[model samples]
Target: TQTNLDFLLQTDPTISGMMQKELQRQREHLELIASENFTSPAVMATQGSVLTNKYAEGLPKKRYYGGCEFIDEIEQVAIDRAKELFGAASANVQPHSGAQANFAVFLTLLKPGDKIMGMDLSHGGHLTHGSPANVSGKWFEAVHYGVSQETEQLDYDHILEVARQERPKLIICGYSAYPRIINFEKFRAIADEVGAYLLADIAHIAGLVASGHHPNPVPHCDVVTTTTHKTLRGPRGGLILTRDPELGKKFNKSVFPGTQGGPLEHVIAGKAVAFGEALKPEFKAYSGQVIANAQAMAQQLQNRGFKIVSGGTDNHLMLVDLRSVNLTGKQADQLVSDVNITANKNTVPFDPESPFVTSGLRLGSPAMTTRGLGTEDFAEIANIIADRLQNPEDEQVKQACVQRVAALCERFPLYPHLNAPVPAM
Candidate 1:
C-alpha cells in the first residue's frame, strides 16, 4: 500500500485508485500464515527508489569505467550490511533471486555435465535444486535426496550415501517447504567428505535466521544464497554470500558478466535497509515469534484433528497433510481460498500424490506476525481453517472467518495515513 499509493498518486491517478481497491482487499482479508510479507516503508523506498535507473555492471570500487562513486558506495553498503546481518565473511548483492544465485553458483563451480545432489522437491526442495523442468536438472546431472519415509525428517545419511556413489561436484543444503532447522554443519561435512562445495539456499528462512529465530548457515556451508523478500522483509531480489575470496570473485563474475547484466541497484538498497533493520534487537524477537506462531498454529490444527506433515513445525511454515483430512491439495487450495485464508499447495516428505494433488498445504506466520499478530490470532486462524476444511459446505463458518479476519485487519492498519503526503525516505 505504501509504495503503490506513494507512487501512483503522483504518477497515475487511475492506477492509484485500482491499487487502492486491491489494498482494501488485502487489508480486509486474513493474511493467515503466508510466506510473503509486506516490507517496511524504509525498505520499500530503498528498493523501489531511483537507484533502479543506474547501470552498475561491476562490483563496488571495481567498475569498468568512471562515475561509479555513488553506486560503489550503494553496493558496498549493501554487502557490508549483509555481512553484518547474516554473519557472512563476504557477500554479492546483485543476484536477481534465490534461483539465479543457485544457478550462478553451479555455473561457477561445476561443469555443465557434473553431478550434483540436492533435496527432492517432494521432500521440500526448491525447483532450482532439481526439477526435471528446471535448468538444474537439464544442464547438469542432479541427484535428489529425500526425507525419511517414517520420521519425515531430512535424511542426511541418504544424501551422504548418494554423494559417495555419485560423487557430485556440489551438494546443496536448504529447502523451500521443510518445517525444521537444517543441520548446516552436517550437510557441509558431507559435502567436504565427498570433495564437494556445500551451497545453502536460505531464501525461505533468511529473515528468521537474521533475527536469530533460525540457525545461520554461513559457518557451515561454503556459499549461501537467499531472497531479500520472504522473511527478510526486503525487496523482491536476491543475494549470494561467500568466504573464499577467489571463489567470491568467481561469484561476482558469474552474477554479472557471467549470468546477468546491469544490477538492480534500487533493490540492493532495499536489501541493505532490511539488513540494517534485522541488526536491531527487536527483530530477533520478531523472528522468535515467527517460529512460535507457526508451532502454535500447528498444535491447534492437530488438536482440531488436522494432521501435520511432520507431526508439528519447528519453523515459520507447516504442512497440512491433507490426505488425512479427505481432501486433495487442489481441493484444499480452493477450500481455503473460499475461506479467504491464502496458502500454497505443497508436497509432503516423499509425497505419494502429484504436485497438482499434493499431500499438504504450506503456510507461514511472518506476514501476519509482522502485522502484529500473535498466538491468540494464530490459534483462531488454525481453528478457522480446520473448521472450514471439515465443513466446506458450511458457508456460515467461512463467512465467520472472513469477518473475523476483516475485524483483525481493522485493528492492524496497513498504512495509517494513505491520503496524507508520502513520508520522507
Candidate 2:
C-alpha cells in the first residue's frame, strides 16, 4: 500500500520538509552529473519497501537465515536477468557499490602485495584502481597506466608495454570519466600476454552495454563490475559478473563474509526492478537517446569554443577542459551551478590543477534525457552553460540563464504528480 506525504509530514516534520524540498529541487534543476540519474518512482518504491526489514545474509536459498524465501526469489531473478543482459555465466547482486564490487573481485583474485595495474585517476580511472589513498593501493602493490598526453586517449601499445614490464597479476580496463569507448579486446589481449586477469569496470556504461549501445566487456574480461545506478538508471547499488563458475564462487564468498554482512534486500529488489526495466525495448530507445543528447551537448559546447577532451564524446559524458577559457574547473562548475545547471569538476588527462580544483568539468545527458530532453534541448542547454561561464559577473545574464533553465524544467516536468505521496512499497 502507499503512504501519503502528509503522513510523513506528521511523523517527522523536519525530515519530511527536507525530503520534500529535495524532491522539488530535482523536479526543477538541470542535472548533468555524469554519475547521477533519475531513477523511476517504481525503483524508489522498491528502495523504501518492507524488504529492507529483512536480513538475507547469504546467496539465494543457501542463506545463513531461514526467512529469505521471497528475497531469494527476487535476488535470483536479478542475477539471472543480469547474466542474460551481459552474457555472463554468473552474476552477484550483493555488492553495496561499484567500489565494493571491485574490492570483492580483488579479494577473490589477488593476495596482499600482489601487483595489479589500472588506469590512473587523473587520466579518467576511478579511485579504487590504484590511488594510494584507497585500499587497492594500501593492501596490494598497484601500478598505473595512462592515456596519451597528446591525443588525450588510451594508448594501448603503451599500456601493453607497461603491463609487460610491471607483470601485474590483474589488469583493469574501463573507467570513471573517460569520454571514449573502451577497447575491451585490446585490454584482454594485453592481460593474456602479461598473464594477468582482466577486470572491466563498466559502472558508467552499464546501461549502454546492456542496451547494445556500447561494447560489452563481459565477453572479453575475466570479471566485470558495475553500479546498478548511473547509466543503468536504478536505485544506487552494485553488481559483479564473471565468465568462470569457479571464480564466481570466490566472488560470492568475498562479497558476503569476506567484506559485507547481511545484504540489503530492498536494494536487491530495486535492482531486479531496474534490470527488468532495462530489458525492455523502450529502455533501449532511452539509452540511444542518452548518447545522442551527449553528442549534441559536446558538439554544441565545442561550437561555443570550449575545449572538449579528445575532441568530442562517443559516450554519455564529455570532459570540458577549462584551460582555454582561463577558468579552473571549480570556477566553471560553480558558475554553471549558479545558473541552475548542475555539473561536477573533474580531472583531465595530466591535469595541471589539483584534485580539489580540477581543470575539467564532466557533463552528461542521461537525467535530462530521461525527462524527455532531445538533442536540440541539450545543445541549447550547452549554449546556456557556455554563456553563463563567460558572463559570471553579469547578474542579468545569470538570471536569464536561470529563466531558460526554468523554462526547460517546466517544459519537461519530471514526475509531475510526485508532489503528492502514493502507495508505499
Candidate 3:
C-alpha cells in the first residue's frame, strides 16, 4: 500500500472542496473589508508549517516543553523584528489573536472591575476596547468616548473630559473603523492627566505604522497590541509591544499563565516573516499605495453623491454613509456582494439604525492593493459599487457591474499558481 501524506483532496474532500471554492471566490471577488488583507505566500507557508505541532508554553528560551530550541529562535526573531519594526523596547508575539492580546494587557494592567476608557464602539472602536458584548466589558468598568458629531472625528478635549470624569485605570486609543490619523501624543497627555495607563490597539493600522505611514504609538503608549493580519498582512495572530521592559515582563506573564497556554509558534514564525518583509523599503511603497488607493476610492464615491464619513479618508479605509443612496448598510453590503465586491456593514457616527442593520459600509484598499490594484482600479471599483447600490433593482445594471468586476479580477490575477498540480502519492 502507498502512503499519502498530502491527501487533503482525497481524505477530506468536503473541506478541501470548500477551501478550493473559497480560494476561487477570493480570487474572483474584491475584498473591501477594512480589517482584512492578503498575506505573502511565505507568511502563509510558515503558518502552515510543522511548528504548529509544538507546545511551547512560555517565553523564548524559557519554555516548559523540550524540543523547542528552533521554536525559541523563531519566536525570538519575531520578537526582535517586532520591536525594531515599531521602535518598541520589547515585544510579545504570543496571545493567539488581537483580542487575546488586548485581554492580556488588561490582565496585566488592571484588576477586574477596574475602570477603563476606550473610544465608543459605535464610533469606530474595537470590541476588545469595551463593547458590552465582549469579556473586557463584562469584567471591567468600561467607559466610552465618541467622535464629535460635528466633525465625525475624535475630539481629544472631549476624550480628556471623559477620562477625567471616569478616572479610568487605563485609556485605550486606536480603533477598528476610524478613517483619520490618531493623535497618540494627545491621548498620552490625557492618560497622564488622569493617572491612567495608555494602551493603543493598532491592529488595523500595524502595517502603516511599521512602514512609517502612520504615527508610532510605542513612544506615547505604555503598551500596544495589534493583529498580524489586517493591514499587517501576516498570519492570523497577535502581538503586544511596550516601551517599558518591566511592563513587557508583566505582559509576557499575563499572556502565558494569566490568559493563554502554549504559544502558536507557527503563527509566530509567520509573524517573523511578515515583520522582516515590512522592514523592507518595498513594504513602505505598498503602504503608501494602500492609502492612496483608499483616497481615490473615497473621492470617487463622493463624486457619485455618496457621503463619506468625516468627508474623506487619510488612511486605508472609509465609512460610506449609505443613507444618501436610500439603502441600509445591510442592503448596500448585499448589493455590492451581488456584483462581486465584498464589504461589511458598519455603523457611522450617530447612526440611526441598529448595529445589525447599520447605516454605513466600511471599505478598505489593503487586500486589492496587495493583489496589485492601483488607485485607478480602486476608483473604478468605487464606481461599480456606487452603480450597484444606486440601482439595486436594475438587472441590467447588476449584470454590467458583474462583468466589470470579473474583468478587473482577470486583469489582476490573485495566486496564479494556486491551481498548480499536486505531487503524486
C-alpha root-mean-square deviation, each candidate = 3.3, 2.8, 2.6
Q: lDDT by residue for model 3 over 137-172, one digit each (tens)?
A: 988988999999999999999898888889999999
lDDT of 2 by residue, 1-425 (tens): 54756678889999998997898899888999998999998998988889989989889989998988899999999999889888999999999999999999999899999998999888888889988899998899989999998999999999999998999999988898988999999999999998999999999999999999999998789999999999999988899998887889989999999989988889999999999999999999999999999999999999999999999988899999887678899999999988778999998888878999999999998899899999999999998988888777999999999999999998998887777546577
191 Cα displacement, candidate 3 (Å): 0.4
lDDT leader: 3
Error of 2 at 88 (Å): 1.3
Q: What local lDDT does model 2 show for residue 420?
A: 51
Return the TM-score for each candidate structure: 0.94, 0.97, 0.97
lDDT accuracy of residue 250 in candidate 2: 89
lDDT of 2 at 66: 93
- Estimate, for each residue in 1-425, the C-alpha lDDT of model 1 and write its tens digit: 46544666889989878877877766666665456887888886776567877888888988776777888897899999998898887899999888888888987988888887888878888889877899998988888888888888887787789889988888888888888889898898788888998898999999988887778998778899998888888888888987666778889899988899888888888888888888998788888888899999999998988888878888899888886678887788788888677888887776778888886888889888888888888898888888888887887987887777677787777756554336688
RMSD after Cα superposition, model 2: 2.8
Error of 2 at 74 (Å): 0.8
